[PDB]
Design an enzyme around this catalytic site. Structure first.
Site, PDB file in Angstrom:
ATOM      1  N   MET A   1      59.576 107.007 -50.576  1.00 21.69           N
ATOM      2  CA  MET A   1      60.914 107.058 -51.158  1.00 21.69           C
ATOM      3  C   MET A   1      60.884 106.720 -52.643  1.00 21.69           C
TER       4      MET A   1
ATOM      5  N   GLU B   1      58.622  84.714 -38.042  1.00 24.17           N
ATOM      6  CA  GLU B   1      60.049  84.536 -37.792  1.00 24.17           C
ATOM      7  C   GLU B   1      60.861  85.735 -38.262  1.00 24.17           C
TER       8      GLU B   1
ATOM      9  N   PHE C   1      60.217  66.184 -44.995  1.00 24.00           N
ATOM     10  CA  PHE C   1      59.159  67.102 -44.592  1.00 24.00           C
ATOM     11  C   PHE C   1      59.762  68.337 -43.936  1.00 24.00           C
ATOM     12  N   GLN C   2      59.508  69.504 -44.533  1.00 23.90           N
ATOM     13  CA  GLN C   2      59.997  70.787 -44.026  1.00 23.90           C
ATOM     14  C   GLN C   2      61.523  70.806 -43.941  1.00 23.90           C
TER      15      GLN C   2
ATOM     16  N   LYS D   1      67.042  67.265 -35.494  1.00 25.49           N
ATOM     17  CA  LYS D   1      66.140  66.877 -34.413  1.00 25.49           C
ATOM     18  C   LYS D   1      66.693  65.704 -33.611  1.00 25.49           C
TER      19      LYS D   1
HETATM   20  C1  LIG Z   1      66.914 104.741 -47.780  1.00 24.19           C
HETATM   21  C2  LIG Z   1      68.355 104.799 -47.257  1.00 24.19           C
HETATM   22  C3  LIG Z   1      69.115 105.949 -47.451  1.00 24.19           C
HETATM   23  C4  LIG Z   1      70.438 105.998 -46.968  1.00 24.19           C
HETATM   24  N1  LIG Z   1      71.153 107.125 -47.166  1.00 24.19           N
HETATM   25  C5  LIG Z   1      72.283 107.271 -46.441  1.00 24.19           C
HETATM   26  C6  LIG Z   1      72.937 108.515 -46.326  1.00 24.19           C
HETATM   27  O1  LIG Z   1      72.422 109.651 -46.976  1.00 24.19           O
HETATM   28  N2  LIG Z   1      74.043 108.610 -45.601  1.00 24.19           N
HETATM   29  C7  LIG Z   1      74.539 107.543 -44.981  1.00 24.19           C
HETATM   30  O2  LIG Z   1      75.706 107.678 -44.224  1.00 24.19           O
HETATM   31  N3  LIG Z   1      73.957 106.354 -45.062  1.00 24.19           N
HETATM   32  C8  LIG Z   1      72.834 106.193 -45.781  1.00 24.19           C
HETATM   33  N4  LIG Z   1      72.253 104.978 -45.848  1.00 24.19           N
HETATM   34  C9  LIG Z   1      72.786 103.862 -45.016  1.00 24.19           C
HETATM   35  C10 LIG Z   1      73.830 103.024 -45.815  1.00 24.19           C
HETATM   36  O3  LIG Z   1      73.457 102.462 -47.075  1.00 24.19           O
HETATM   37  C11 LIG Z   1      75.055 102.436 -45.067  1.00 24.19           C
HETATM   38  O4  LIG Z   1      74.618 101.709 -43.973  1.00 24.19           O
HETATM   39  C12 LIG Z   1      75.972 103.573 -44.602  1.00 24.19           C
HETATM   40  O5  LIG Z   1      76.114 104.499 -45.617  1.00 24.19           O
HETATM   41  C13 LIG Z   1      77.368 102.994 -44.253  1.00 24.19           C
HETATM   42  O6  LIG Z   1      77.488 102.911 -42.829  1.00 24.19           O
HETATM   43  P1  LIG Z   1      79.043 102.893 -42.179  1.00 24.19           P
HETATM   44  O7  LIG Z   1      79.958 103.716 -43.058  1.00 24.19           O
HETATM   45  O8  LIG Z   1      79.010 103.477 -40.785  1.00 24.19           O
HETATM   46  O9  LIG Z   1      79.614 101.310 -42.112  1.00 24.19           O
HETATM   47  P2  LIG Z   1      78.923 100.098 -41.165  1.00 24.19           P
HETATM   48  O10 LIG Z   1      77.878  99.357 -41.971  1.00 24.19           O
HETATM   49  O11 LIG Z   1      78.283 100.714 -39.944  1.00 24.19           O
HETATM   50  O12 LIG Z   1      80.126  99.027 -40.679  1.00 24.19           O
HETATM   51  C14 LIG Z   1      81.040  99.452 -39.655  1.00 24.19           C
HETATM   52  C15 LIG Z   1      82.308  99.607 -40.226  1.00 24.19           C
HETATM   53  O13 LIG Z   1      83.332  99.886 -39.143  1.00 24.19           O
HETATM   54  C16 LIG Z   1      84.091  98.835 -38.929  1.00 24.19           C
HETATM   55  N5  LIG Z   1      84.087  98.509 -37.537  1.00 24.19           N
HETATM   56  C17 LIG Z   1      83.140  97.843 -36.902  1.00 24.19           C
HETATM   57  N6  LIG Z   1      83.476  97.733 -35.621  1.00 24.19           N
HETATM   58  C18 LIG Z   1      84.659  98.339 -35.426  1.00 24.19           C
HETATM   59  C19 LIG Z   1      85.512  98.554 -34.323  1.00 24.19           C
HETATM   60  N7  LIG Z   1      85.156  98.054 -33.003  1.00 24.19           N
HETATM   61  N8  LIG Z   1      86.644  99.219 -34.508  1.00 24.19           N
HETATM   62  C20 LIG Z   1      86.990  99.684 -35.700  1.00 24.19           C
HETATM   63  N9  LIG Z   1      86.211  99.499 -36.759  1.00 24.19           N
HETATM   64  C21 LIG Z   1      85.051  98.837 -36.654  1.00 24.19           C
HETATM   65  C22 LIG Z   1      83.510  97.560 -39.817  1.00 24.19           C
HETATM   66  O14 LIG Z   1      84.628  96.757 -40.353  1.00 24.19           O
HETATM   67  C23 LIG Z   1      82.760  98.252 -40.942  1.00 24.19           C
HETATM   68  O15 LIG Z   1      83.686  98.558 -42.085  1.00 24.19           O
HETATM   69  C24 LIG Z   1      70.979 104.915 -46.308  1.00 24.19           C
HETATM   70  C25 LIG Z   1      70.212 103.750 -46.110  1.00 24.19           C
HETATM   71  C26 LIG Z   1      68.899 103.702 -46.590  1.00 24.19           C
HETATM   72  C27 LIG Z   1      68.058 102.442 -46.381  1.00 24.19           C
HETATM   73  C1  LIG Z   2      51.058  69.571 -41.531  1.00 27.64           C
HETATM   74  C2  LIG Z   2      51.197  68.674 -42.767  1.00 27.64           C
HETATM   75  C3  LIG Z   2      50.756  67.354 -42.717  1.00 27.64           C
HETATM   76  C4  LIG Z   2      50.885  66.535 -43.857  1.00 27.64           C
HETATM   77  N1  LIG Z   2      50.447  65.261 -43.784  1.00 27.64           N
HETATM   78  C5  LIG Z   2      50.292  64.596 -44.949  1.00 27.64           C
HETATM   79  C6  LIG Z   2      49.559  63.394 -45.029  1.00 27.64           C
HETATM   80  O1  LIG Z   2      48.965  62.847 -43.878  1.00 27.64           O
HETATM   81  N2  LIG Z   2      49.433  62.778 -46.196  1.00 27.64           N
HETATM   82  C7  LIG Z   2      49.990  63.286 -47.291  1.00 27.64           C
HETATM   83  O2  LIG Z   2      49.838  62.613 -48.507  1.00 27.64           O
HETATM   84  N3  LIG Z   2      50.688  64.414 -47.264  1.00 27.64           N
HETATM   85  C8  LIG Z   2      50.852  65.084 -46.111  1.00 27.64           C
HETATM   86  N4  LIG Z   2      51.560  66.232 -46.102  1.00 27.64           N
HETATM   87  C9  LIG Z   2      52.037  66.812 -47.390  1.00 27.64           C
HETATM   88  C10 LIG Z   2      53.482  66.328 -47.716  1.00 27.64           C
HETATM   89  O3  LIG Z   2      54.521  66.536 -46.755  1.00 27.64           O
HETATM   90  C11 LIG Z   2      53.871  66.058 -49.192  1.00 27.64           C
HETATM   91  O4  LIG Z   2      53.574  67.175 -49.955  1.00 27.64           O
HETATM   92  C12 LIG Z   2      53.093  64.848 -49.720  1.00 27.64           C
HETATM   93  O5  LIG Z   2      53.098  63.844 -48.771  1.00 27.64           O
HETATM   94  C13 LIG Z   2      53.777  64.322 -51.009  1.00 27.64           C
HETATM   95  O6  LIG Z   2      53.012  64.747 -52.141  1.00 27.64           O
HETATM   96  P1  LIG Z   2      53.167  63.857 -53.564  1.00 27.64           P
HETATM   97  O7  LIG Z   2      53.430  62.409 -53.217  1.00 27.64           O
HETATM   98  O8  LIG Z   2      51.891  63.969 -54.366  1.00 27.64           O
HETATM   99  O9  LIG Z   2      54.455  64.453 -54.471  1.00 27.64           O
HETATM  100  P2  LIG Z   2      54.507  66.005 -55.129  1.00 27.64           P
HETATM  101  O10 LIG Z   2      55.165  66.950 -54.148  1.00 27.64           O
HETATM  102  O11 LIG Z   2      53.103  66.474 -55.426  1.00 27.64           O
HETATM  103  O12 LIG Z   2      55.393  65.965 -56.559  1.00 27.64           O
HETATM  104  C14 LIG Z   2      54.783  65.380 -57.719  1.00 27.64           C
HETATM  105  C15 LIG Z   2      55.457  64.193 -58.027  1.00 27.64           C
HETATM  106  O13 LIG Z   2      54.954  63.637 -59.344  1.00 27.64           O
HETATM  107  C16 LIG Z   2      55.837  63.816 -60.301  1.00 27.64           C
HETATM  108  N5  LIG Z   2      55.222  64.471 -61.413  1.00 27.64           N
HETATM  109  C17 LIG Z   2      54.985  65.765 -61.513  1.00 27.64           C
HETATM  110  N6  LIG Z   2      54.401  66.007 -62.682  1.00 27.64           N
HETATM  111  C18 LIG Z   2      54.258  64.849 -63.347  1.00 27.64           C
HETATM  112  C19 LIG Z   2      53.728  64.462 -64.596  1.00 27.64           C
HETATM  113  N7  LIG Z   2      53.160  65.453 -65.499  1.00 27.64           N
HETATM  114  N8  LIG Z   2      53.757  63.181 -64.935  1.00 27.64           N
HETATM  115  C20 LIG Z   2      54.269  62.261 -64.131  1.00 27.64           C
HETATM  116  N9  LIG Z   2      54.776  62.589 -62.949  1.00 27.64           N
HETATM  117  C21 LIG Z   2      54.784  63.864 -62.533  1.00 27.64           C
HETATM  118  C22 LIG Z   2      57.087  64.736 -59.715  1.00 27.64           C
HETATM  119  O14 LIG Z   2      58.373  64.262 -60.265  1.00 27.64           O
HETATM  120  C23 LIG Z   2      57.018  64.479 -58.220  1.00 27.64           C
HETATM  121  O15 LIG Z   2      57.814  63.259 -57.855  1.00 27.64           O
HETATM  122  C24 LIG Z   2      51.444  67.033 -45.014  1.00 27.64           C
HETATM  123  C25 LIG Z   2      51.892  68.367 -45.067  1.00 27.64           C
HETATM  124  C26 LIG Z   2      51.764  69.181 -43.937  1.00 27.64           C
HETATM  125  C27 LIG Z   2      52.246  70.631 -43.983  1.00 27.64           C
HETATM  126  C1  LIG Z   3      54.463  69.637 -34.450  1.00 25.94           C
HETATM  127  O1  LIG Z   3      53.831  69.474 -35.687  1.00 25.94           O
HETATM  128  C2  LIG Z   3      54.294  68.375 -36.416  1.00 25.94           C
HETATM  129  C3  LIG Z   3      53.628  67.968 -37.525  1.00 25.94           C
HETATM  130  C4  LIG Z   3      54.083  66.902 -38.231  1.00 25.94           C
HETATM  131  O2  LIG Z   3      53.407  66.469 -39.377  1.00 25.94           O
HETATM  132  C5  LIG Z   3      52.024  66.682 -39.348  1.00 25.94           C
HETATM  133  N1  LIG Z   3      55.169  66.268 -37.832  1.00 25.94           N
HETATM  134  C6  LIG Z   3      55.832  66.677 -36.729  1.00 25.94           C
HETATM  135  N2  LIG Z   3      57.028  65.984 -36.289  1.00 25.94           N
HETATM  136  C7  LIG Z   3      58.024  65.566 -37.257  1.00 25.94           C
HETATM  137  O3  LIG Z   3      57.870  65.791 -38.410  1.00 25.94           O
HETATM  138  N3  LIG Z   3      59.223  64.885 -36.811  1.00 25.94           N
HETATM  139  S1  LIG Z   3      60.391  64.402 -37.958  1.00 25.94           S
HETATM  140  O4  LIG Z   3      59.822  63.312 -38.753  1.00 25.94           O
HETATM  141  O5  LIG Z   3      61.634  64.108 -37.240  1.00 25.94           O
HETATM  142  N4  LIG Z   3      60.677  65.721 -39.010  1.00 25.94           N
HETATM  143  C8  LIG Z   3      61.000  65.445 -40.399  1.00 25.94           C
HETATM  144  S2  LIG Z   3      60.940  67.301 -38.404  1.00 25.94           S
HETATM  145  C9  LIG Z   3      62.667  67.400 -37.865  1.00 25.94           C
HETATM  146  O6  LIG Z   3      60.115  67.528 -37.217  1.00 25.94           O
HETATM  147  O7  LIG Z   3      60.754  68.236 -39.516  1.00 25.94           O
HETATM  148  N5  LIG Z   3      55.382  67.737 -36.026  1.00 25.94           N
END
Ligand SMILES: Cc1cc2nc3c(=O)[nH]c(=O)nc-3n(C[C@H](O)[C@H](O)[C@H](O)COP(=O)(O)OP(=O)(O)OC[C@H]3O[C@@H](n4cnc5c(N)ncnc54)[C@H](O)[C@@H]3O)c2cc1C
Ligand SMILES: Cc1cc2nc3c(=O)[nH]c(=O)nc-3n(C[C@H](O)[C@H](O)[C@H](O)COP(=O)(O)OP(=O)(O)OC[C@H]3O[C@@H](n4cnc5c(N)ncnc54)[C@H](O)[C@@H]3O)c2cc1C
Ligand SMILES: COc1cc(OC)nc(NC(=O)NS(=O)(=O)N(C)S(C)(=O)=O)n1
Ligand SMILES: Cc1ncc(C[n+]2c([C@@](C)(O)OO)sc(CCOP(=O)(O)OP(=O)(O)O)c2C)c(N)n1
Ligand SMILES: Cc1ncc(C[n+]2c([C@@](C)(O)OO)sc(CCOP(=O)(O)OP(=O)(O)O)c2C)c(N)n1
Ligand SMILES: Cc1ncc(C[n+]2c([C@@](C)(O)OO)sc(CCOP(=O)(O)OP(=O)(O)O)c2C)c(N)n1
Ligand SMILES: COc1cc(OC)nc(NC(=O)NS(=O)(=O)N(C)S(C)(=O)=O)n1
Ligand SMILES: [Mg+2]
Ligand SMILES: [Mg+2]
Ligand SMILES: [Mg+2]
Ligand SMILES: [Mg+2]
Ligand SMILES: [Mg+2]
Lengths: 582, 582, 287
Positions: free
Chosen positions: A485, A59, A121-122, A171
């Protein structure tokens, strides 16, 4: 007239309303990664015959691809992810789009509304997480709010100062049947009332008056001029003022032009920083006065009347108080000043040849220099060859590090949106996915990723995306086996004490690790490695001529340093002009 | 007695105070990625002779490695990143550690205090971003607060309900000279006053009284019992109650034992869900009643007196109201009940053989089943071979998807902390970096990454970390060329309409893409691919016997489905027991 | 309306808060800093370059003096009824404009700002940004403590005065010479004025008296001062107004003067919300 795939009285899923809302915004390409929370959106995407999905392998690669899609075309970039881990992987891209003012619309799935806040979840509060790294975000709580929120999301992301807008869709909203109302009015009353207006003539005539009264004017162009290349060039013809661009404003005014001072700032040219240091009128157009350009604010342009034009009122006077300010679009401000400069041309008698000759002397005595050691490939020279073989017409995306600076210094960008780089956030792993989005938005263009061995490997999984989508993405990998760098700052300020900057294998110290050619071979991408400077020209030519993707592993000596360098918090008198790590 | 590298009266950098603060906490391994904001910390790490840094190739791989380091050892995992893009790459790991209650301490660099809030170079409000996905976070505003905050960070991350704690350190604090005071008292008055106390005898005797009055008791064991393997096993001997574990509680009670019902929930065994459905006493020890286990809460354990023991008072009665509750450490609650069950043994006369035979009948009629198609490798069978060849003593880390469920079903974990998987957040790309952290914390152990082709490629860059650090990490890659979990839900509930779930190359449809063997070859890791079921046993044996890292590309038919499956929001009567995508 | 405010002027904005410069209107020249230092720096330039600049705006001042004589602050006197504007004008004369004035919020607040000539800053204590009623009486307490030898007068309204009327006990216990010039109009006058102008004089809970005894001054504010041992008096006829205010000032310690005013008075002039200079209301009331 938009043609829907559903009848105006036919109920449809909320996910089908979301996709149609994108179609009505002109969206043709999205970067979506499927998940349980966003399966309804992905099913609705297949029903769309106009929206193409480029499936990434991460992503973060999807949101960075949406940036390159936006940076290289002006259109907003759309990335879609699922809830939880899919949404949290967009964080680096959202913060990167905010600092660089990139129009972006991120759509994330969410647990059903009844399950929000129950540690489901997620489930992650992505709105609470991304509120401080986005221009604005939403949590759709009803299916009928989808047409309005999507319209508000694209409006906020593209108008004014662009930025990322996140839309969290539960969702149950995606599955709910409803009849969309596409005539709803946007609920942005305070934002639209604060939108900048066309610049007044009194402000523009005062700027033109300061130009005639000044003897050493310097243009300070930045990322705000990406849509004013023609207006800025017309402004330079009528004034003859030298142009100094930021890292974001590269390409706005051609680097190969005689009136171009190239980049300024920490790693900007000596003559560009000299012009701003000894200027009496600083025309800051579309900049934000970053510390990478100013350094110590007390000494930055200490003798210049500062004219700041910006579309964001919060940027005018933040780090430095200007004499004259214009809050609005710099595109319109240039159009208004060009009319005054042409009618009152002979009345003003603008001529800065004495100031330009003072800079031409500084340009010839302190130009961009690189040293060639035997047959070792200079990274600056390799990029200079890429400029020649592509005629400067290639879209360049870079990572972050030494290679990023050399790609900015030693490439002459003719137009804006050829230069895609992370400047504000400076996120590594940006080069490769951004080249994916640029190649999709510009299929007939030469897209080259000037990446570093550290930045390239972070999102190396997107090589599979390049092969599957058959994108002609070229990878000019400047491999120096180090985090260059950070290595450079170790040599300068830490007595060359290496602190986890070597990226190779300490066991086989003189072996290129990792073998980046096998990464391209794993994804069926033709690749080659070049080590000798003589074979460099033929290798880059083979990369360009070979159809489809190509990776060129360019081996470079790691002791190279990016020059010149102004230390953090320093002034122009502290610029470092020579030295490396040998 | 701690031996410092500095005199008690000698001023030292704040970064040197930070590293020494880690040394005084027993930290031996950190996962740090260098950057401009954290260069002082990395320089101070080289001066430490006891703290080893494992340099990852991506900060998300660094925080996931800190999770596997913590999940496989009980110690807290420490990851370090720079400001801006380095900090934002930890977001997925912080949210993952919070939902799974993993002790973690994340240290991020930050812009100097004077530059905070000025949109500085590589600045993101990481405290504002991670407040809702961390147990607690800090912003160090003075160098003298470093010894206290680090002590509070490790205390909050490891005590009570474990979780991630982020410490943001500005650069000027790292450079400031100071004399640390290691005698400061922690400022956690409300947290320590709310810490759970040892369980009272009146609550424990009421639980034992409900055990003797019950006829169909079922143990509901989860992630809270990772430190109570001996106490839980002693409790089962004195009661004979069958054990049903969650995805997080696997290994707490041995899966190979006759009294084990294996996993319950959506993809849990039919007999485990049958036991909870027809129980009269549910002993919920260390669980949080996730919807992945309960489904529809109205029908989950509808005939059982629920006894919930949890260390977090917010979890007791959240999704379901229990009859008897005990807020405290389940380790102490088991120790107190074991004493009552042994003295009053002959007084209680506990025997549930009639209830166990009712479950043994359900276990024999509905066991975990997989179908073998010709010479194609069944993914369930491959994991079952890994169990035999490793004697069930291997540390298993997995990604997320179908392979994650099969690795949970068809592997018998003898002890907890052998099973490292993302359950709460379910983050892909977790398997490979978690195996790195587990191999570092357990060098003499067999570490195997049962990964999927989609999850493995997300953080494939960490293969370079495995080679450089020379870690004996085995990668059992179950390659099905698809996002199998999302593909399964497409076949069941979307008429098999593929929506961007195929991970291969559509041009060469019958070619394994990407060639994962060349990914391992790029990082100098020996690899091999097995396709026929007969060659599977010898291939896995070669992976285990070959010293160092190894990748085994196991090709599996993508039409397989994870069974059984209870649909979202369903009950036990809605369990799906047969079917696939053919 | 910001579009019409100073539509023909080059705006020079000096402010110590950078967030205020360019918020609602973009200036031509801006100076972020202390206006005290900005004036000191400009005074030196204006004195050395005095004869070089030859500053003279007598033509512009005469254009304003003509507007000042044709549209001055005006109030109408009805019989013997006390004009609230006239009462404050008498307080200015009898105190020589040297009194510290604290006010509530409403019509009385505006008349105390218009018809009193303040010679120095920090004589005028009023809630402007928030506009909180009940501010006048307690603020006079704090001003009298910080300035014991000063004339502190609370020009309060019957609605604002009663909100924090309990502070009369604080004035007596601390023995503070706080004068209360209460302009009593038996109404929430500011809200009543907006009812007459934009709501057809439809009263919506703005009368503060007793509807049973409609022509009785309610509440009897004199007994509020008597409860706290504060001498008080009520004046209704315009002729007795000068002697009543003089008695309030001459009487040592606290004093409350209940000044009865006709409620039909309106604060003039008035520019409606969102209006321009061409929409200024110059005449009219509620009769
Ligand atoms: C490793 C590294 C080294 C760098 N060293 C340098 C360097 O030596 N020199 C350097 O210049 N940069 C350097 N930078 C980049 C840097 O940190 C900044 O991105 C840059 O310095 C500032 O860009 P800018 O002044 O054009 O403003 P921008 O980030 O480009 O923003 C645009 C500005 O113009 C305005 N604006 C936008 N659209 C309009 C519009 N339609 N009309 C009027 N105004 C508008 C916005 O309000 C904003 O204030 C470096 C970056 C890195 C990662
Ligand atoms: C693709 C996918 C599928 C999944 N399907 C399943 C599934 O089929 N089944 C499943 O079980 N999970 C599944 N999960 C995992 C899931 O979403 C959760 O992580 C899980 O269900 C919950 O874990 P848990 O109940 O052990 O709580 P945890 O997340 O492990 O948290 C621990 C709990 O115990 C408590 N606790 C922590 N330490 C102590 C301590 N020292 N003493 C007392 N209490 C403590 C905490 O307060 C917390 O409430 C799936 C995950 C994914 C990514
Ligand atoms: C595609 O793969 C999976 C896997 C999986 O678990 C194994 N579950 C789902 N679907 C849901 O979880 N629906 S839901 O309950 O409405 N959600 C909480 S959500 C919005 O999607 O995060 N898809
Ligand atoms: C996600 C991320 N993590 C860490 C970063 C901190 N930085 C850098 C910096 C400038 O941001 O320092 O502040 S540059 C850099 C190393 C660059 O490795 P290369 O790709 O090989 O490029 P080169 O041609 O060799 O120099 C690091 C580690 C970063 N920006 N992004
Ligand atoms: C960072 C991330 N992005 C997307 C995810 C949404 N999901 C899944 C899920 C269960 O979380 O759905 O909710 S599983 C899955 C696909 C699994 O690909 P595989 O590795 O090949 O495993 P397999 O053996 O083939 O099945 C996706 C895309 C996720 N969890 N994490
Ligand atoms: C705490 C508080 N509550 C209500 C208020 C809303 N307002 C007003 C306003 C301008 O803020 O309207 O926006 S003025 C007003 C009535 C003034 O009663 P008075 O004291 O008799 O003065 P007068 O000489 O008769 O006019 C009200 C009710 C307020 N500001 N503060
Ligand atoms: C190592 O590579 C680089 C590169 C680079 O720019 C090219 N600058 C720096 N150093 C700083 O930026 N120092 S700083 O000004 O105090 N910061 C804002 S910070 C806390 O580090 O984000 N390191
Ligand atoms: Mg990656
Ligand atoms: Mg490098
Ligand atoms: Mg798969
Ligand atoms: Mg401003
Ligand atoms: Mg009143």
């Amino acid at each position: 007239t938009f043609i829907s795939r559903f009848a105006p009285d036919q109920p449809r899923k909320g996910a089908d309303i979301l996709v149609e809302a994108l179609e009505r915004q002109g969206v043709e390409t999205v970067f979506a990664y499927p998940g349980g929370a966003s399966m309804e959106i992905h099913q609705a995407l297949t029903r769309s015959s106009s929206i193409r999905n480029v499936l990434p392998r991460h992503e973060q690669g999807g949101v960075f691809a949406a940036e390159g899609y936006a940076r290289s075309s002006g259109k907003p970039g759309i990335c879609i992810a699922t809830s939880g881990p899919g949404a949290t992987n967009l964080v680096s891209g959202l913060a990167d789009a905010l600092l660089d003012s990139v129009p972006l619309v991120a759509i994330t799935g969410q647990v059903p509304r009844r399950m929000i806040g129950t540690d489901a979840f997620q489930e992650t509060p992505i709105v609470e997480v991304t509120r401080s790294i986005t221009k604005h975000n939403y949590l759709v709580m009803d299916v009928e709010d989808i047409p309005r929120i999507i319209e508000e999301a694209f409006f906020l992301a593209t108008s004014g100062r662009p930025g990322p807008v996140l839309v969290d869709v539960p969702k149950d909203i995606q599955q709910q049947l409803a009849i969309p109302n596409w005539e709803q009015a946007m609920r942005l009353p305070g934002y639209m009332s604060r939108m900048p207006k066309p610049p007044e003539d009194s402000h523009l005539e005062q700027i033109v008056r300061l130009i005639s009264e000044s003897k050493k004017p310097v243009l300070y162009v930045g990322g705000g001029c990406l849509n004013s290349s023609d207006e800025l060039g017309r402004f330079v013809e009528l004034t003859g003022i030298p142009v100094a661009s930021t890292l974001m404003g590269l390409g706005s005014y051609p680097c190969d032009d005689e009136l171009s001072l190239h980049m300024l700032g920490m790693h900007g040219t000596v003559y560009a920083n000299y012009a701003v240091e000894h200027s009496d009128l600083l025309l800051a157009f579309g900049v934000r006065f970053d510390d990478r350009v100013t350094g110590k604010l007390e000494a930055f342009a200490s003798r210049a009347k500062i004219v700041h034009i910006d579309i964001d009122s919060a940027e005018i006077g933040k780090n430095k108080t200007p004499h004259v300010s214009v809050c609005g679009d710099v595109k319109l401000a240039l159009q208004g000043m060009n009319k005054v400069l042409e009618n009152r041309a002979e009345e003003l008698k603008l001529d800065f040849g004495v100031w330009r000759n003072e800079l031409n002397v500084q340009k010839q005595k302190f130009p961009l220099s690189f040293k060639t050691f035997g047959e070792a490939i200079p990274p600056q020279y390799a990029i200079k060859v890429l400029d020649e073989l592509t005629d400067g017409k290639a879209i360049i995306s870079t990572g972050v590090g030494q290679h990023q600076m050399w790609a900015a210094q030693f490439y002459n960008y003719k137009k804006p949106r050829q230069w895609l780089s992370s400047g504000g956030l400076g996120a590594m792993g940006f080069g490769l996915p951004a080249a994916i989005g640029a190649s999709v938005a510009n299929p007939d263009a030469i897209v080259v990723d000037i990446d570093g061995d550290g930045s390239f490997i972070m999102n190396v999984q997107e090589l599979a995306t390049i092969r599957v989508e058959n994108l002609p993405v070229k990878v000019l990998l400047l491999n120096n086996q180090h985090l260059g760098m950070v290595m450079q700052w170790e040599d300068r300020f830490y007595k060359a004490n290496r602190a986890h900057t070597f990226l190779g294998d300490p066991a086989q110290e003189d072996e290129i690790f990792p073998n980046m050619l096998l990464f391209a071979a794993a994804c069926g991408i033709p690749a080659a490695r070049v080590t000798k400077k003589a074979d460099l020209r033929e290798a880059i030519q083979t990369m360009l001529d070979t159809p489809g993707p190509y990776l060129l592993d360019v081996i470079c000596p790691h002791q190279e340093h990016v020059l010149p360098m102004i230390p953090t918090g320093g002034t122009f008198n502290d610029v470092i002009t020579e030295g490396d790590g040998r």
